[PDB]
């Protein structure tokens, strides 16, 4: 980047790199939390499928 | 040099709104994510109360 009278400051350079480090971290935060998530989803999908299967038995007359 | 460093910030910038579409992508599906789990819980909790009710 710069040093630190252009049109572009050394503080300007180094805010956006941070801003994009940011957002990159975001991004892989968002994607290891969606992972979990989706983990998750097939465990209670699976719950429902024991649940369902003992709903039907339970009515079966 | 001037004209190369703007070149660099700019490109830096638009760097940055990719990740910040990317972001607004994943907390979408995330939010959708998150809703089908609260979702799904109430409705292993319907079945649960309701196989009770069955026994009863």
């Not at 971290?25 to 994607?31: F, G, N, S, T, Y």
């Not at 999908?45 to 038995?57: C, T």
Request: charged residues 30%.
């Amino acid at each position: 980047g710069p040093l630190g009278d252009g049109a572009v400051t050394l503080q300007e350079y180094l805010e956006l790199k941070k801003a994009l480090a940011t957002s990159e971290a975001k991004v892989q935060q968002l994607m290891k939390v969606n992972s979990s998530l989706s983990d998750e989803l097939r465990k209670l999908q699976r719950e429902i499928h024991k649940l369902q299967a003992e709903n039907l038995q339970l009515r079966q007359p």
